[PDB]
């Protein structure tokens, strides 16, 4: 990262203007900035250093190393990273399509084939991550973005703040991730690996098909219990119109034991992902309505 040059020397943005703010998070704020030299529109992630403990700062530096190691079409590319005496500035490629789940609910047509295109992009990005021994650890709809408000815009995964680098096989990296997408191995606090990402994909794919998560419980202890014992189902009637290929793919992605869980490469070679005509074609309006309820529920 550039510790000598100021972000404000290479990029232009008024951090005080409201119309510059792309996103407001609890630990950072993402503004729309413009490359002074090239005119490229970018999303800078501003992180004040003020109240930050050392663990948080090194978490950020970890995110910078990992994000710089990653150059893939379906990963939001970090252009450059800056650190001055008060702020981190993580410049990223501009992403204007918003969250994937916020856009699916606005589609007039959505079927398993669309869900398979999304999952294909997510899986390919994950294949690039795991190839470099990177575990995202926190895959969730908030991290699944669309590059543009255009149809057929690419899905890009993002937010590697919780990402870890696995050097020596299954390793304990701590208990992190959002509860609904936590892998059983992480809940058990045993050493884990890239398989945890696969787990989240399963949970995500499930949602992509029906609009509600397989593990939903307000009590996080009963939720972690459901995840450990792999207590989920395909309720009628929503799942009766789903291909058994998708159902089997989710059953595989949600394998309670990481050793029996497919790698992302194996998933990318699954017929529901690789064959353009295995996923169902019928429009799933119920998935869209349930997904509006879901999007509403997670924010609140």
Author numbering: 3 to 302
Quote from the publication.
The S. rosetta kinase domain, including the autoinhibitory segment, and the hub are 52% and 41% identical in sequence to the corresponding domains of human CaMKII-α. Although S. rosetta CaMKII contains a residue that is equivalent to Thr 286, it lacks the two inhibitory phosphorylation sites within the CaM-binding element of the autoinhibitory segment (Thr 305 and Thr 306), as well as sites of regulatory glycosylation, nitrosylation and oxidation. We expressed, purified, and crystallized the kinase and hub domains of S. rosetta CaMKII separately.
Ca2+/calmodulin-dependent protein kinase II (CaMKII) is a Ser/Thr kinase that is particularly important in neuronal signaling and cardiac function. CaMKII has a unique architecture, in which the catalytic domains are linked flexibly to a hub domain, also called the association domain, which forms a dodecameric or tetradecameric assembly. We reported recently that the activation of CaMKII-α by ATP and Ca2+/CaM triggers the exchange of activated subunits between different holoenzyme assemblies. Our data are consistent with the idea that the CaM-binding element induces the hub to transition from a closed-ring form to a ring-opened lock-washer configuration, which can release or capture dimer units.
